[PDB]
């Protein structure tokens, strides 16, 4: 439990570490006494307890702030059909359409994860690393949040060719087989790219087009919808809205993975 | 005593913050420091040199609209009034 | 006993304010217990009145219990004397208020029912209007001040001073005395004693100056307050009849039950 | 009035002006020389200044703006250019 | 529908205003709604607005005008100061009735500064508090002016200023005094005029 | 929203209360109504604010040093206290004091027995808590168990809000000197909030509020109620509350 | 239920006043928005005075117990 701790003697008081363990014992048992908290938003739970796509309502998309679009002065008019109206100098995104597009994109993610394809989560804004990492880890996927090297797909040999590759079985169990240099040198292209900030990631979108990779993206009021295969109209500027949508997609991928493992265990 | 510029006089009846007791407040105040700015037609003051001597320079040069801050129409009317006043022996 | 009241009698209710068991537990049991403990505290419980006990033994750590129990008896007696019961339905027939009562908005700034002037107390009405702006303001402040007390305490209408200059509302907690002259300056005197003890063995200047000047009156040292009314905020009076959620209902019944005759009868003339 | 600019090749200040804090030594020296001009040379009326001067110049006789960086960093974001 | 929820949403609850965020005139009362965030949301730059607020902002309070602008920023100031003035007034205890029984835009009574009713005494371990003592700062040589609890008040003396006043001069504000807040009314402009006396 | 916790064996608690302490209508008054009342008031006092995300213990620690939030503190304290008390009188989730608890009693209360310390607690509650309050047996950082009596909604965790002295009535010079020392120690803290460290934790909690005993005992007889509480503690909980 | 102003899970602020006003309008208890708004205003004052007295008395009672 707690090795390399030397207790104190009964004559002498608690030490600092003993006080720490004592208040931990208090925290896990009695600190939470008095009342249970209900109907209160906790930011971490969007990442670790995202809902299923079928359980998402317009109200939960709105509470996440997905409906809040860009300033009307920065409108890209090709997004006209996604807009519900303008209010307080910004465009409001039609959350019914957001929900429909989100369910479609979630089903695409689930289908690709169920087929054993590679899923890549791209988001290069400040505090998006946690959600991207968790989405990748629960989908058995991959993510980038630091920077998209231009040419990562169309110039994969010069960029990603050196990093290591691995053979895996139907259950995603490492086989630990020795790969040939030729096999190691091949391109390993994602089967699905999901980008949280497509306006600042035009390079990735264009590479996906050239490399012929279907893509999902959160499309704000200033973003070009036609640059992605499966748009999701929504706010790409709020970490809460982005993490809500990302967690939904990650859970859909997790369900696809669970189904794949289930049939591979039968 | 200290120079009045370096000090800040908090007015009476006004709320304040601790920031107001600082050089930042004075500096922010420096950086962020009438009859014609109204429905009145300046062309009715062409016979009133005192009023429209406020919108000229010490030598009598009409002030640019950047200075006067008037609307384009009232700048044009004021310039017309000043020139007419100069012509009719006033001003 | 010297504590006994006239309009309160065993086996009867206080009309719409208390029920038989409610009054039994609010008044008779409590007075019995306080007497049975004050007798233990001292034998003067009958030799001398209550206010003499409260004042003579004041500021005494050793005689703390005499002061506590005499004060509590006197406050409770005052509070229950000022009342006469109301016409509203008896508290035992009415259903007990539940959690929803917490969400009701009070109407103390919209409606008022029982006023001094209605019963013929023009002088009390005028004094209250001069002191609290209006009767509705007075009722709001009184009821809110008593409702805000979490535990044991009283809310006192009090005339500052026999002449009164201005009326006020004061709160006492755990058998505190509405009178101020007896206990004023106590902590300052204890601080002086503590500092002298230290000398035998500036923060002093600031602390003592602030204490004395705060307790300093207007062109005087001792400021006395004369009780006029008392409302008991203790759970012991309203729990039995009104339940956990019914303190505000109890206070509204109390307001409807006040007898302003006695309150005007207690007014210190005028300055 | 608002005067919006066309798309610029850059957003740069040619010669950014900085906070040149004045040297304490020179201020003390000027005050001391003023004192000697008014109250006479080697006057006792500002020996303190002399002391202070001696204390401040004893070891050493004498006792950059970032606007361009932030302007270049933020120009594309704030310029209000229409979308491509 | 989405429109009804938007009308009821928390952003919609904040009344529209475009008053300057860097006003340098006279401040009699708040002009901007203070926006607060919990520590957990602040850690993730989440404020319930459109866009994530920059990480430089460590304070949990701000005021804002526009959710988004042509400059691709939110116009905000990381300040929630006017709440501390109000609370400090609540600490003073001095009270300031239209709160008792087509549209009028004038401030009603106190504009929410205080809801305390006039006549009540503050019991204390010493005894009933006769008068309210508060720390403050004399401002300038002038009824003098004092900065007390976020408000500028009028100081009246018992007999005359002490020697410390003219000894310090324009540095008089550096030292803390004790004041008795005599009274506090509010004028038509919305400004509170407390009258105090130095002690 | 703050919601009243669900207790183990709630049906039996609503049907027959707590055996040997409370009837059904007594436990309903002290828990199913008082705790609901307190949780509703806390929700109304903290909704739309940061404190709504915190448990009552964390709320009372956060608001303990802020004078104007005292009402919230009171609520957050009573709620917490009211569940510390109920938890250690519930029939179950024959329990006996552990060897460690009795050992610490012998090392704290001058080598006295547990029953003697119980009688001392009866006496302490009888005298130093006039009206509403709480009785605690608490452990300090010195591994010392001592009896603490708070008035109204004082907390056992944070000594500047113990409220162990009634300043409405006269106090001894010893108590005044204690208050002076505590005030000086509070001033000794460097943190701008003015808080201090206090590692005291409650081992036993008894509710001396009228919501607990008044219906089943009467205006007097609170000593009988406290005796019934201390003779019928849930010693599994009380033993778990002591650090091993 | 906007038949009352206080709601569990909400603070007391201007939105309580305005939601109560809208409720009063849609139930036709008042015909004019001005009168409904004034009624909501006075309920809001009633609740605010209670809250402020609660705070002040809580602090006073806290100081009286050390
Ligand atoms: Mg965007």
PDB file of C-alpha atoms and ligand atoms in Angstrom, chain A residues 70 125 220 222 235-237, chain E residues 50, ligand 1:
ATOM      1  CA  UNK A  70     -18.341  32.994 -34.957  1.00  0.00           C
ATOM      2  CA  UNK A 125      -5.246  24.355 -29.904  1.00  0.00           C
ATOM      3  CA  UNK A 220     -17.639  26.708 -37.246  1.00  0.00           C
ATOM      4  CA  UNK A 222     -16.010  30.730 -40.583  1.00  0.00           C
ATOM      5  CA  UNK A 235     -18.215  25.750 -31.920  1.00  0.00           C
ATOM      6  CA  UNK A 236     -14.519  24.926 -32.374  1.00  0.00           C
ATOM      7  CA  UNK A 237     -13.308  27.685 -30.018  1.00  0.00           C
TER       8      UNK A 237
ATOM      9  CA  UNK E  50     -18.045  31.409 -27.075  1.00  0.00           C
TER      10      UNK E  50
HETATM   11 MG1  LIG H   1     -14.147  29.158 -34.488  1.00  0.00          MG
END
